[PDB]
Every structure is written in structure tokens, then in C-alpha cells.
Design a protein around this ligand. Structure first.
Ligand code: ZN
Length: 737
């Protein structure tokens, strides 16, 4: 009885959530191969023990899929420079650690089983880097480029309507660009340009030779007097001073502007045309519903929350304008990133398409205001530092190959699909995650092992064509028991979250929610067939809990009010957040922090970091005499109990007593106390584990912002949502019927 199969009575067990982070299940391969397997932080499967047939997979109920964070920053990476990149003659799989050499001069492909000759240059060919590491990166040549590797090109398209000016994001963006101007990935060929827009479209001529920027204003984006692209997307090094002058002036160019219109559509169409020749990255900053010209959007959100209980009203795009724009951009290797900083509905569902279909990124800062909502301003500052300095890959493509019999079925993420197994990524960034559901078209009886291999081809910021490859090997099994033994619950949950997004949009929120519950009912019913109480194998003991958490997440919840743009953003996050970050949004990590200690702590970055144990998401865990920190992935909350020890309030919060604690507190004082040092050290550790900067909110029991915290205690009953106990009873009833 492997331990992953040890029975767990979920009906009775009140302690199932581990105190420490859940580890990915190690694929059950022999010792030698295990050491060679792919990092689960880069590439993992929902079922580490692969079902031998589609019939067995169907009997299991669990979804078979892959999750990847293909371009994440790595501490070490074997870089291979060879005149010949060895690949299979029949399926083009890259030679890897799991192939077999049948004569030292020939290798058999582990995906299609065809025999290939080993090139002389590749030569003890089995001790080659490609065969000793499952994650490598090749430097490719002319045979992997249709044109010379494009230089880095950056274009900023900024909303300067009165609403946008009032918001005050310009100062933040321009200051960030100035501080990081010499840190943008690229070389001497790097080009950059700027555009602003209100009722008209504004271009900025920054060509070398000018003493100051020349602003060009047009209402017709096809104006024949407009200069050539070389004067708008200029060489960063050559026009450095002109660029800095523009960056210093922008925040004070539209002060108290009379313009209220935001012609985003025309601006983006002009951007497409400008970027078409080279491709690159477009960064769009929008603060309200596009109101003029092509692509203008209506304020269609339905105020009646109950009208969206079964089918979310206006959840899908209102038009295909932005999707079409993104597809056209992808065709020219142009990615479009959206930074939405609106205080009123702006139809993110429609706008998000500009990024979704161009491999772009979506950032959302609701009710952003430099002065009145400074936490969003500081967050943008930090998010921009990462956005502007992280590595980047241009004009990229990614293909995922798999052993014969296996097939890619549905991809999840931001990209332009070009095949059953090929994705076009105008840009590939190190923070993007992807997922894909698989199917078994032909029984996997040929061998006892299957392999999955991700190949990411891109142009580096230095002009080199590179191919980063990840190879994952998994054992094939023929019994249901074994399938349940190798399930990766968090991977399954993340894949189901993506499937639920598709179902909510194409069918209804009701159907998506029902399918999520059905996954639990079906899997545990199927499990029961292999063996008064809801039983589950250890591997799935957290499955019901995670599904309940998902059902209460902003994306799919129906019990409490949810603004449309807010729900859409939650869905966007599911589609692009790597598993490690997405799981915190699905099931927040709760910690008691008024009594942090050394014991258990770890040492990192040369400091002692407390390691408090994870607490289940229920008010039952909230000692009224303590303080707790909830990590929801994108935001932090610190709940302070009415009877919380004053030592904590005084030494950590910086106040005499509970009553003196202010509301709307978003920062922890840098107090010279041991407890403040521990708390801050802990929180700094949390922040350093992810690319984005979560805003911190200190919540008092007094009931104003209390709900924001209690809505995350997903194990408790609420308005129209089951408690964990009730949910299990519900699952049981369905299975017993
Ligand atoms: Zn092959």
C-alpha cells in the first residue's frame, strides 16, 4: 500500500491540511531516471502515473494535463552551443536524457521510437549535456530564423484623458522608466517609442538631431504626412536625452486637461501599424471604457448581481475588435500588455483580448489614484520594476511534443494557437504560466514510460535565437489504484480552474460550478469502486477542500457581490499564473503571527526567517487574542483580534492599544523591536518568493473591511455557500445516489 493510497476518512478527519507547503509528487521512476527528471516548478503533469488507455483514464475521472512555467528565471542552466542540434528524424523531438542508445552511434527516440543516427560532432554520446540534463537551452543558427533576429522594440501607449490624468499613474510610470532606462533588456539596437491619446492620437518624433520632442497630433491614424516609423520608434542609445526629456515632461503635459475622451481603439490600430515591421512589446495604460472611435465600448455591466447567478451577464467580449487586434499583432510578433487602472467598469472582458491573443500580460489596479489610493500606486511602482527589468524573449514559438498515443487537446493561457501542439508567443516573459489538457488517442502499450517535451524557440534581448527545452518522463500504469497513487492534486486543481473558466464563458457559471463539484463526486466515486463515510486516498485528501475553495474564489463565487471586471481579472489570473502562485489565490495561506519564533525558522538572504505553520481557512483557527496573516497570493491581510496582545499591537503595529489602531492601514512600521523584525522578515520572505508585489491590509475586528478577510475563510458557511462539513455531506449524497 503506497502511502499516497492510504485511506483517509474525510468525514471524520479534521486535520488534513499540512502545516508546510505541499510538494509535487515525484514520478515513480527508477533512481537513476528520477535524478534526471524535469523540475516540477517548470513542467508537471496532473497524473504522474499515466493511464495506459483512454478507457482507464475515463474510469479515473481525473483530468489529464500538463502545467508549465517555461521561461522562469533559473539559477543554473546548461547552455549548449553546437553546429548541430540533434533531433528525431520523424517527430523532431530533441535528444534528451530519456532516449536509448542502441549502439553508441544510434539513438532510439523515446516519443515515436524511430531509430536515428548520432552525428559525429555529437561525439560516449550518452555523457553529452543534452542527455545529462532535462532542462537545457540551445543557441540556434540560421535554420531557426525566417528573418534576422529582431532587436528589442518597446512602445508605450498612454491614456491621457482627464480621468487618466486625475488617476496620476503617469508620474509612477515615467519615474520607473527613467530609473530603469538603462536596465531594459536589449542591446545597442534597442528601439523605443511613445504615444498618448484622448480625443486624438499623439505621436512623438524623437529622431536623432532634434533638440526637443515633436508631438504630432492626428484624428486620422492613416494621415499621409506622418513620418516613417524610424522617427517614432527610435534608437534608445542615440536618442537617450530626448527620451528622458519626454519622460520628465509627460507627467506635467496634460495637467487638468479639458479632454475627457479616450480613443483607445484608434491608438492601438496606430500602434499595430507602427510595430508591424519589427514586432516587439506594446505596453498599454488605460483608465476607463474606450469612448471614441473604433473599439469604443458600452457600459453594459448589469448592476443586478442576482441576474448573473447562473450566467454572468456580459462576461464575454462585447466585440471581437480587441481579439482581432491581438491576432493581427501576433501575426507581426507584437505582444500587447494591458495595464487597466479604472475606478468604474471598463469592460476588462473585451479589453483583455488584446493581451490574451498576443501572449501579453494583464495588470489590474482598480480605483487607482496616486494620492487617494497610494497602495495601488506603490504596487504599480514595484510591478513596473519587475516588468521593465525581467528577461524577455521576442518572436517566440513553443511546441509540446509527447509520446505516440498522447495528444494535446486544449491549451490554456495567453498566446496564438497555430497547431494541435504549437503556440505562437509574440513575446515570452519569465512570469507566464500555461496549461494544456491531453487525451489518449492510441493505447500506450508500446512501452512502460511516456515522455513530454516542451520546446521554446525565441529571440533573446541580445539578438540570438535560442531554444529552451524541458523533458518530462513518467511511468505508465494499468490499474485505477496506481492512477490515484500518482495524482498531483494541486496540478489537477489548477487545470480544473482553467477548464472552469472556459465552461463559465462558453456555457454558464452554473455549469462550470456543477462540473467542478462533479469532478469531486466522480473521482471519489471511482476511487471507492477500487476499495457512512467519504473516503479518499491520501493523494486526494485535499481535493474536496480545494474544490470548495475554488468555488468560493472571485472567479466562480455566487454567494457575495462580485464586480464584473473583478471576476474577469480573477479568470485572467487563472489563465496565466504558474501553479505555485495560483494555488495561493485559490486557497490562501493563513498564519498566526503574534507569536513568531526562531524554532523552525530558516536562514535565507543571510537572515533568520520565521516559519509559522499553515492554518486551515476557518474562523475556528482565529484566536481572538492573536494576530493572523493571510497570504492570498496577490494581496496580504493581517487580521487583528479585539483581544490581541498589546505587546503585538505596540511592538509590531506601533500603537498603544487596539482602539488606537487606524483603519485603512497598508504598511507595517519599521520598528526597532524583535517582534517587528520577525514579522517584517517573514513578510519580506513572502514577497521575495513571487514576481509581483502584494498590497498589505491590516484589518481590525470592527466591521468595515472585516468581510474582505472573512470571505477567504472558505471552510466556513456563508450567505449561500456550503461550509466544508456541508460540502462533504453533499458530495457523499451525490455519490450514494
Ligand atoms: Zn521521434
Amino acid at each position: 500500500q503506497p502511502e499516497s493510497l492510504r485511506p483517509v476518512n474525510l468525514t471524520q478527519e479534521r486535520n488534513i491540511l499540512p502545516m508546510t507547503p505541499v510538494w509535487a509528487p515525484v514520478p515513480n521512476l527508477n533512481a537513476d531516471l528520477k535524478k534526471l527528471n524535469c523540475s516540477p516548478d517548470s513542467f508537471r503533469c496532473t497524473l504522474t502515473n499515466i493511464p495506459q488507455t483512454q478507457a482507464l483514464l475515463n474510469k479515473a475521472k481525473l483530468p489529464l494535463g500538463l502545467l508549465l512555467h517555461p521561461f522562469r528565471d533559473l539559477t543554473q542552466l546548461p547552455v549548449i552551443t553546437s553546429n548541430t542540434i540533434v533531433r528525431c528524424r520523424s517527430c523532431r523531438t530533441y535528444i534528451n536524457p530519456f532516449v536509448s542508445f542502441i549502439d553508441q552511434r544510434r539513438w532510439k527516440c523515446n516519443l515515436c521510437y524511430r531509430v536515428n543516427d548520432v552525428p559525429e560532432e555529437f561525439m560516449e554520446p550518452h555523457k553529452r549535456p543534452e542527455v545529462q540534463n532535462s532542462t537545457v537551452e540551445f543557441i540556434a543558427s540560421s535554420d531557426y530564423m525566417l528573418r534576422p533576429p529582431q532587436p528589442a522594440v518597446y512602445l508605450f501607449v498612454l491614456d491621457v484623458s482627464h480621468n487618466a490624468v486625475e488617476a496620476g499613474y503617469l508620474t509612477i510610470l515615467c519615474q520607473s522608466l527613467l530609473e530603469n532606462l538603462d536596465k531594459l533588456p536589449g542591446d545597442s539596437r534597442t528601439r523605443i517609442g511613445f504615444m498618448t491619446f484622448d480625443s486624438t492620437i499623439h505621436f512623438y518624433n524623437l529622431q536623432e538631431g532634434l533638440s526637443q520632442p515633436q508631438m504630432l497630433i492626428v484624428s486620422d491614424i492613416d494621415d499621409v504626412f506622418l513620418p516613417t516609423p524610424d522617427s517614432l520608434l527610435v534608437n534608445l542609445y542615440e536618442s537617450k536625452e530626448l527620451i528622458k526629456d519626454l519622460l520628465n515632461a509627460l507627467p506635467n503635459m496634460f495637467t487638468n486637461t479639458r479632454e475627457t475622451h479616450s480613443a483607445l481603439g484608434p491608438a492601438l490600430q496606430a500602434a499595430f501599424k507602427l510595430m508591424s515591421p519589427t514586432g516587439g512589446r506594446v505596453s498599454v495604460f488605460q483608465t476607463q471604457l474606450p469612448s471614441l472611435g473604433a473599439g469604443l465600448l458600452q457600459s453594459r455591466e448589469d448592476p443586478n448581481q442576482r441576474s448573473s447567478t447562473k450566467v454572468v451577464q456580459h462576461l464575454g467580449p462585447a466585440t471581437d475588435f480587441y481579439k482581432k487586434l491581438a491576432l493581427d499583432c501576433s501575426g507581426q510578433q507584437t505582444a500587447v500588455d494591458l495595464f487597466l487602472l479604472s475606478s468604474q467598469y471598463s469592460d476588462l472582458a473585451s479589453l483583455a483580448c488584446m493581451s490574451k491573443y498576443s501572449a501579453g500580460c494583464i495588470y489590474y489596479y482598480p480605483s487607482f489614484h496616486y494620492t487617494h489610493n497610494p497602495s495601488q500606486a506603490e504596487k504599480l511602482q514595484k510591478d513596473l520594476k519587475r516588468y521593465l527589468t525581467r528577461k524577455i524573449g521576442f518572436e517566440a514559438v513553443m511546441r509540446i511534443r509527447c509520446t505516440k498515443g498522447l495528444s494535446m487537446h486544449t491549451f490554456h493561457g495567453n498566446f496564438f494557437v497555430r497547431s494541435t501542439d504549437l503556440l505562437s508567443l509574440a513575446n515570452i516573459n519569465p512570469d507566464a504560466g500555461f496549461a494544456v489538457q491531453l487525451s489518449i488517442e492510441e493505447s500506450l502499450t508500446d512501452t512502460s514510460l511516456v515522455c513530454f517535451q516542451t520546446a521554446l524557440l525565441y529571440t533573446s534581448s541580445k539578438g540570438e535565437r535560442r531554444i529552451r527545452v524541458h523533458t518530462l518522463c513518467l511511468p505508465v500504469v494499468s490499474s485505477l489504484a496506481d492512477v490515484y497513487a500518482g495524482v498531483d492534486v494541486q496540478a489537477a486543481i489548477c487545470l480544473l480552474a482553467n477548464m472552469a473558466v472556459d465552461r463559465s464563458v462558453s456555457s454558464s457559471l452554473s455549469d462550470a460550478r456543477d462540473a467542478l463539484v462533479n469532478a469531486v463526486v466522480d473521482s471519489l466515486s471511482a476511487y471507492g469502486s477500487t476499495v457512512s463515510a467519504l473516503m479518499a486516498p491520501s493523494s486526494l485528501k485535499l481535493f474536496p477542500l480545494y474544490v470548495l475553495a475554488l468555488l468560493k474564489q472571485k472567479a466562480f463565487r455566487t454567494g457575495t457581490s462580485t464586480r464584473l471586471d473583478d471576476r474577469v481579472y480573477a479568470m485572467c489570473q487563472i489563465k496565466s499564473q504558474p501553479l505555485v502562485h495560483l494555488m495561493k489565490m485559490i486557497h490562501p495561506n493563513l498564519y498566526r503571527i503574534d507569536r513568531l519564533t526562531d524554532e523552525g525558522a530558516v536562514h535565507v538572504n543571510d537572515r533568520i526567517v520565521p516559519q509559522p505553520p499553515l492554518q486551515k481557512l476557518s474562523a475556528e483557527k482565529l484566536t481572538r487574542e492573536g494576530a493572523f496573516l493571510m497570504d492570498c497570493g496577490s494581496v496580504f491581510y493581517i487580521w487583528v483580534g479585539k483581544g490581541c496582545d498589546n505587546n503585538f499591537i505596540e511592538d509590531v503595529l506601533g500603537y498603544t492599544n487596539f482602539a488606537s489602531i487606524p483603519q485603512k492601514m497598508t504598511h507595517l512600521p519599521e520598528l526597532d523591536t524583535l517582534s517587528s523584525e520577525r514579522a517584517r522578515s517573514f513578510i519580506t520572505w513572502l514577497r521575495d518568493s513571487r514576481p509581483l508585489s502584494p498590497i498589505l491590509h491590516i484589518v481590525k475586528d470592527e466591521s468595515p473591511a472585516k468581510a474582505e478577510f472573512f470571505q477567504h475563510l472558505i471552510e466556513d458557511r456563508t450567505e449561500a455557500a456550503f461550509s466544508y462539513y456541508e460540502f462533504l455531506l453533499h458530495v457523499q449524497q451525490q455519490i450514494c445516489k
